[PDB]
From a paper:
determined the three-dimensional structures of these four agarases. initiated by GH86 or GH16B, which generates NAOS. depolymerized by GH86, and systematically saccharified by the exo-acting GH117B and GH2C enzymes. exo-acting β-d-galactosidases, while GH117A and GH117B are α-1,3-L-neoagarooligosaccharide hydrolases.
replaced with W657 and C598 in GH2C, respectively.
Residue numbers in the entry: 46 to 93, 104 to 533, 542 to 586, 607 to 686, 694 to 847
Write the structure that this text describes.
Amino acid sequence: MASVTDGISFNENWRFFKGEIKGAEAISFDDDSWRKLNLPHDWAIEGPGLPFHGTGWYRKTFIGDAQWKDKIVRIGFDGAMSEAKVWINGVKVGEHPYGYTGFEIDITKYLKIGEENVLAVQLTPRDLSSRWYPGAGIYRNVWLRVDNKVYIPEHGVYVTTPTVTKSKAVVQIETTVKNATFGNGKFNIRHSIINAQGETVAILNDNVEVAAGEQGKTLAYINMLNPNIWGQKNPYMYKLKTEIYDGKDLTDTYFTDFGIRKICFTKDGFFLNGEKIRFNGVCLHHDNGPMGAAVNVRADERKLQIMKEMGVNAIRTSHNPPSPEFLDLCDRMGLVVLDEAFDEWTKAKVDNGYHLYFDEWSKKDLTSLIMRDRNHPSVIMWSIGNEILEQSDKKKGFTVAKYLADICRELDPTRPSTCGFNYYPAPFDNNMAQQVDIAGMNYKPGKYAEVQRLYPDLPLYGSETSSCTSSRGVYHLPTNQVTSYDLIGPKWAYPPDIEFHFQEMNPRFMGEFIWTGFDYLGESRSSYFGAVDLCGLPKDRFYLYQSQWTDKPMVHILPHWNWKKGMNIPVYVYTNCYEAELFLNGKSLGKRVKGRDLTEIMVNTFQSKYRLSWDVPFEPGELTVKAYNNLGELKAEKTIRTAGKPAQIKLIPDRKVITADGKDLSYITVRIEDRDGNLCPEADNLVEFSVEGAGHFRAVGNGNAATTESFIEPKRKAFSGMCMLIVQSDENKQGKMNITATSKGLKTAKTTINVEL
Ligand SMILES: OC[C@H]1CNC[C@@H](O)[C@H]1O
């Protein structure tokens, strides 16, 4: 029934064709040769940065179900990258250029009940339309919505919490109802607020009069006593079930996930639930490396989990709306989010960027973003742009900023607007920074003090920071890869130590958002900016951040200990403990106290309190680091060993049990070890993979930016000792999935993944 169903998946059973072909929108077109696949789908991750432009066609053929007779029928696309045209039974019903905002088509008038129907989508992504890897295809989920003629249209519930206290929160709810009948009506609304255990704990009644053919809105509120407060440690989520009634008859059911938290900002900082919050933040691009751009919940969850292990409490969605699923995870995992709309406005950064669409589409797209995301408790700011060229239009650039900021204020005043500024002092002197609620600075720690003198009333944070580059496990002593000593970057870049320093000296700054948390795909086809590599393996940079951003005692040592006798090895230790002591084959090499024994790093040079360092003449064997508190008590330790020749493969699944849904993944780390089980720190052995039983091979990676190996062939070379196998369940198939990893001259490895549900 249409009254109980709130939008089901329309992802299954499509036809795809990469390339231009005449008349493929037509009912009678013959797509029998076309490849068969389920959405979501990124075609650009398959081919051989990686080519992302051209033409792609999708067609789905379906019977008009008898239950859809006299119903309103819509197809929702969360994302199609990019330049979409859509047809139903040959009639054009949709056209959407921007690939990061979703859109909806109404197929009610053209739907044929009991006969065949053909939904056709053409994507024409252009070259030079993105500064990073966008993907190509219907890369986000697609939804079928079958409603009765009185119903809640898309983004039709808006949930706010204008009072949030320990004793009582007030939940305010705006309901939008569409009356597609030929009669005026008064309709009842029942809001059921449902807790984490599935029990309805409060019901709020409302109603609305809507004339025939029209849409109406109504507002009501309800008290929640002793509420479960959404916070970073305890990210408690409620579920709102909204039911529409026409007299005794239910006409529609509509669900909204929401949380209960208050946010507040002054010129001196940001506040969550009445407490100062600081952003230990990361920028992330939307791809998931070997998995490409197609939405995958587990891929995103893993990425966010790894970021939380680093001490990350905040995300900047550089530089576009993310998927809804990504934001659902942030909600569930207690991360605060800066939800960013655009990378350029009226002035072009790239030839076929958003400036082509800005005048016609900017209001519609920003409106669509805020309407889509204004119920996520994770979202705390609307970022209207990143590094936009209008920063240097002295006379008029501020007007475009105001225009976008006013739309933020009109649609959702419960969250501040912001923007990421890379020019200095331009947008501060040109009246631009003042048009948003909170100003973000990109790569300007040296100017933090000065901008506060000149513009003391602006709230501030580092919207983009560091841009330090490294390759995982690569050290250049004394290139095509970059040193993992974390010194090098582009002209505006600087090591993390510099941001930490200037964050401490400028407490008003709300925090930072590093470029980037994970490596991402480009247009060397991928990045080096990530603290974690493209397949989810932490670089040494991860531990530098972890040492600064977490309390749980840790210690990490670099580099590896496969060197030549005679070399002097600079040895760096990152810890959150008071001091550390280095031991080479049992012999002490000295204590070093953090904040006292400083490490000089080249930028001219900086004395950093954030690294501990030794100069060690290389004798082979084992190098052990011990971290202590200020009483001398051992709190953590790590040991690294000079490894021998590659002898064996070890396989480490992140999860030995996965869901039998056809989408869920196990990420199996692949190690190249010597005879004693020590990792071979520079190994590049080709590993081959075989997957049998309940599931299949999905993808491989190694975090190497400068390779052309496929992400989707069952073979991959190690990089700096490791690579990564990704397997996936088959839908509704339980049991064992058996993996075998082989490599010429090494001991074969096996592991089993169990698949349930
Ligand atoms: O260091 C490179 C970064 C500069 N800021 C904008 C990002 O998208 C990226 O290009």
